[PDB]
Amino acid sequence: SAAMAEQRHQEWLRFVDLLKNAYQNDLHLPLLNLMLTPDEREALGTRVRIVEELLRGEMSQRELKNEFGAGIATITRGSNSLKAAPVELRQWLEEVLLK
Template identity: 45%
Template sequence: MDTKIKNISSLVNYLLARTNPEEMEQSLNELLTASELDEIVNRLQIIKMLKKGIPQRKIAEELGVGIATVTRGSNALKKSREKK
């Protein structure tokens, strides 16, 4: 198994072992810096907005992020859809 995949799998299993939202939040705060957590929250918002069909420029404006960040999210979403 690829080391990167094994490490992601380990992270996923670690997070899935949390039994409630409070434990999950605590684990995320232990694993990530405040800025990393903010970035992940933004990326989640970007994906949700893209799935709703909101234009990339509007997403960038509303979230205060660069268009490149939104495009990266769009490309990731397209890749995940291609794998299905």
């Protein structure tokens, strides 16, 4: 269904706008506590580190598993997402995460 696609998209955008507005109002921290589970927040903090190590390119698949608990699927998803990402995002992340 493409009408669902549309509706899911609009609902996602609504969340993105809400959070943007929270940051503007300095309510992002309590909004993110409410909206994300503890495990999802932990995952997000760890995925910044995974992305940072995928861009750095030093750690092997096995070291990434050792350090982050991230198996082949999760690492593949990360690699795929970096390939799918707009090039400006990948370049900006290399600047901000590896600085």
